[PDB]
Amino acid sequence: MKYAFFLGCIMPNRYAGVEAATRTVMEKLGVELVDMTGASCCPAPGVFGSFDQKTWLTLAARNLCIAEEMGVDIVTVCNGCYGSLFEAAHLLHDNKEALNFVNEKLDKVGKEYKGNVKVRHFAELIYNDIGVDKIAEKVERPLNINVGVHYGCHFLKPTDVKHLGSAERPVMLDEIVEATGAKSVPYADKMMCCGAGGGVRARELELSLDMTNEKIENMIKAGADCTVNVCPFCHLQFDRGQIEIKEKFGKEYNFPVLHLSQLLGLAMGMDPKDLALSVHQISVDPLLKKI
């Protein structure tokens, strides 16, 4: 398996520990990971789709052109990038007036999208193509902790195009993190938004934090020792949001936040420091204590 590795923005520029975690995690599962030189903002579908639908698709189709001219499919680590590029690839393949509009724009940069790129999410790629058995075989240190799984919205949905099964009651990420030896705990409104998407974090910050705090409460009330995500924006919102939540609401939880690649990382015998866990603004050390 050779995959063009779309980086996005948050993971490379703020949570690089996830990038290090992912490169090794998938290294051992047996995927050569290529770089897409010059890939930009995907661009974020919630914010830019809301600003100008044409701009979202044109700039998104361009990043896809990078991968097809490389002759390779994209894998991404973020629901935001996954949604934006997957929906872009799907819309251009399925709507020919949208495709004509885009290539008339990509013509001015010597580019043309022709429809070969497949967009894949690394968690879905792990489930469908690699196998969850190959995740358990590789656990160097089992993690017997209770984990509050946060799927994020742009992973499974829209189900009519993603074809990743149920968005109301999924098992895909729960089986992945349980293969590490952990227990996925049920909690109230599990599939609800973290609050950050759609430009809301930037425009209505506490509105987003009210929804993250709702999620955190339900997780700990279900006995979760940490949360796990498949999206850097969820990561920053759950992580940096807790600093903010404390400053503005007065709620303090010290609730550790992990991206799945980092949690799988520990399963593989990775060093805390190459995970840049110190970079988390809420200390994971209470978690490292229990593991």
Ligand X SMILES: O=S(=O)(O)CCS
Ligand Y SMILES: C[C@@H](OP(=O)(O)O)[C@H](NC(=O)CCCCCCS)C(=O)O
* Contact residues: ligand X, CB under 6 A: 44-47, 79-80, 154, 197-198, 231, 233
How far apart CA 81 and CA 47 sit, in angstroms, is 12
Q: In the bound complex, what is the minimum distance in angstroms from residue 131's beta carbon to other proteins?
A: 26
Q: Is 147 among the residues that bind other proteins (CB under 8 A)?
A: no
Class of residue 8 by CB neighbours under 10 A (exposed 0-12, middle 13-18, buried 19+):
buried
Tokens of 17: 């520990």
Residues 74-103 that bind other proteins (CB under 8 A): 91, 95, 97-98, 100-101
Contact call for residue 167 and other proteins (CB under 8 A):
yes
Sheet of 32-35, strand order: 32-35, 2-6, 74-76, 119-121
Q: Which does 128 bind (CB under 5 to 8 A by kind): ligand X, other proteins, ligand Y, none?
A: none
Identity of the residue, 49 or 80, whose beta carbon is nearer to ligand Y in the bound complex: 80
112 close to 106: Cβ distance less than 8 angstroms:
yes
Amino acid identity of residue 127, one-letter, is Y
Interacting residues with ligand Y between 58 and 117 (CB under 6 A): 80
216 vs 11, 116, 171, CA distance in Å?
22, 40, 20
Residue 106 binding target from ligand Y, ligand X, other proteins, none, CB below 5 to 8 Å by type: other proteins
By the 8 A CB rule, do 209 and 243 touch?
A: no
Among 26, 39, 47, 224, interactor with ligand Y by CB under 6 A: 47
In a 13 Å sphere around the CA of 290, the CA atoms on its Cβ side amount to: 13
Q: Which two tokens stand for residue 159?
A: 């189900």
**Residue 43 binds other proteins (CB under 8 A):** yes
Residues 169-208 that bind other proteins (CB under 8 A): 169, 186, 188-189, 191-193, 195-200, 202-204, 207-208
Tokens of 147: 């984990």
40, 103, 116, 146: residue in contact with other proteins (rule CB under 8 A): 40
Number of residues that bind other proteins (CB under 8 A): 79
Query: Residue 45 or 170: which CB sits closer to ligand X?
Result: 45
User: Which CB, 148 or 198, lies closer to ligand Y?
Assistant: 198
Please, which residues have CB within 8 angstroms of residue 2's CB and are 6 or more apart in sequence? 31, 32, 34, 72
Binding mask 222-241 for ligand Y (x = CB under 6 A): -----------x--------
User: Does the CA dihedral 94-100-101-104 come out positive or negative?
Assistant: positive
Contacts with ligand Y by CB under 6 A: the residue count is 6
Q: Among residues 11, 21, 44, 123, which is the contact residue for ligand Y, using CB under 6 A? A: 44
Applying CB under 6 A, which residues contact ligand Y?
A: 44, 47, 80, 201-202, 233
